[PDB]
């Protein structure tokens, strides 16, 4: 079970099927950010999908091979979060991402707060190129969400 | 152990809803993956 797309992650060591986070399938690899899995196998129907390269700072992990979503933000569009929150369906978010401004640089950042479970969930160009991770962000004065674009 | 169900294609919807704002914020990024609001 390999072809392309947005994928659940759901384990089985709580109460119940539980979904951890979200996850894309391209070119024969999986991609989700570490916090989801941290860096454990998945199943895949009968196939198993072991871990090929992660990093805690970036927050990423691979399966079955290297990283292979380079699409970045062009910093002036607007983009769509396909938000897969645990229990509904996929949804398409539109929405012209913020900045996070550090000291090595700036990222795109989607003021959007979704369940934990949502951790994963690519965000799209206008030309359907996944251009970042949506999970990895923090938590403002009025108490909602802003999660970075983040990218490998 | 952990496994995963598909949930959809990876495209773009053109009549989605349209939300959230455009904050500039100033942010740190620690070593454990972790930002921070400075
Ligand atoms: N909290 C708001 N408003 N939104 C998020 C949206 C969904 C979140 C998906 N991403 C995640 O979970 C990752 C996992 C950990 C990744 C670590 N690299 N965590 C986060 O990125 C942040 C921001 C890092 C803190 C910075 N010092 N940590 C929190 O947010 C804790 C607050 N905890 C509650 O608020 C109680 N639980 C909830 O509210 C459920 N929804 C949320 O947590």
Not at chain 1, 51 to 59: A, F
Request: glycine share 14%.
């Amino acid at each position: 079970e390999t072809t392309d797309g947005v994928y659940r992650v759901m384990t089985r060591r709580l109460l119940g099927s539980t979904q951890v986070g979200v996850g894309v399938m391209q070119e024969g690899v999986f991609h989700t950010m570490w916090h989801v899995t941290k860096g454990a196998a998945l199943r895949s129907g009968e196939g198993r999908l072991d871990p090929y390269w992660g990093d805690v700072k970036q927050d990423l992990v691979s399966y079955c091979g290297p990283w292979k979503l380079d699409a970045a933000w062009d910093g002036l569009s607007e983009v769509q979060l396909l938000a897969v929150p645990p229990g509904e369906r996929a949804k398409n978010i539109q929405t012209l991402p913020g900045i996070f401004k550090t000291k090595d640089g700036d990222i795109g950042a989607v003021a959007l707060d979704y369940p934990a479970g949502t951790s994963g969930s690519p965000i799209l160009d206008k030309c359907g190129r996944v251009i970042g991770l949506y999970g990895n962000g923090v938590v403002i004065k009025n108490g909602s969400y802003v999660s970075a674009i983040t990218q490998g | 152990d952990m496994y995963i169900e598909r949930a959809g294609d990876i495209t773009w919807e053109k009549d989605a809803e349209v939300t959230g704002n455009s904050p500039r914020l100033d942010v740190a990024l620690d070593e454990s993956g972790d930002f921070s609001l400075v």
